[PDB]
Amino acid sequence: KELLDSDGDILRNGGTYYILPALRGKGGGLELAKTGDETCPLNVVQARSETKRGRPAIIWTPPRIAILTPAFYLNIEFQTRDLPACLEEYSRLPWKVEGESQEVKIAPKEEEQHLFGSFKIKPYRDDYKLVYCESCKDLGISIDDENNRLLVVKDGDPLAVRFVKAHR
């Protein structure tokens, strides 16, 4: 039980991966979406189409070690290629759970001293789940009024995922 990407390679500290659903039929990989009223796509969501792999995420922990295990506290951030205009000015797109709403959002304006990695990746059935440590709670999907598949803290109904190397 190492954390493995879909090829069977151990997840690398600082490696870049698509986060894809382990199960079929409910949507595709994780990406960004504009939700509610915001003019900028700040919510982490699951793509509605099964065909979409979404946006690669860089996953890393401050310890300067080569690989990741379920014991490490992770920063997760979206890779920044091909961004909409309102995000182009940022070089980093860190995931951060919004207290009260429990939505996973990116926080590109937050100052670095206020950003830390609170996620873990855990084995889940035959693949993986993401958890957020506030003890740890599963990340899952909550559907909003416009049918966006929001990634949110949802203890006990995790989104099953696997990690695919993002080549480029």
Author numbering: 1 to 134, 141 to 174
Sentences from the paper on this structure:
The plant protease inhibitor EcTI from Enterobobium contortisiliquum is a classical trypsin inhibitor belonging to the Kunitz family. A Kunitz-type inhibitor that was first isolated from Enterolobium contortisiliquum was named EcTI. It was shown that EcTI inhibits trypsin, chymotrypsin, plasma kallikrein, plasmin, human neutrophil elastase, and Factor XIIa in the stoichiometric ratio 1∶1, but not thrombin, bovine pancreatic elastase, or Factor Xa. The fold of EcTI is a β-trefoil, typical for the STI-related family of Kunitz inhibitors. As found in most known Kunitz-type inhibitors, EcTI has a single reactive site located on loop L5, between β-strands 4 and 5.
In this work, we investigated the structural basis of the activity of EcTI by determining its crystal structure in the unbound and trypsin-bound form. The structure of free EcTI was refined to a higher resolution of 1.75 Å. The final model contains two inhibitor molecules, two imidazole molecules, two glycerol molecules, and 244 water molecules. Molecule A consists of residues 1–134 and 141–174, whereas molecule B contains residues 1–134 and 141–173. A loop region containing residues 23–26 of monomer B is in weak electron density, but is still included in the final model, whereas the density for the loop containing residues 111–113, not traced in the complex, is very clear. A molecule of EcTI contains two disulfide bonds, one intra-chain and one connecting two chains. However, since the crystal structures of EcTI were obtained under mildly reducing buffer conditions, the disulfide bond Cys40-Cys86 was broken in molecule A of the free EcTI, as well as in the inhibitor molecule in the EcTI-trypsin complex. This observation indicates that the disulfide bond Cys133-Cys142 plays a more important role in stabilizing the β-trefoil fold, whereas the disulfide bond Cys40-Cys86 may not be as necessary for its stability. The equivalent residue in EcTI is also Asn13, which similarly forms a network consisting of several hydrogen bonds. Taking monomer B of free EcTI as a reference, only the Cα atoms of the P1, P2, and P1′ residues exhibit minor shifts, whereas the remaining residues of the reactive loop are in almost exactly the same conformation.
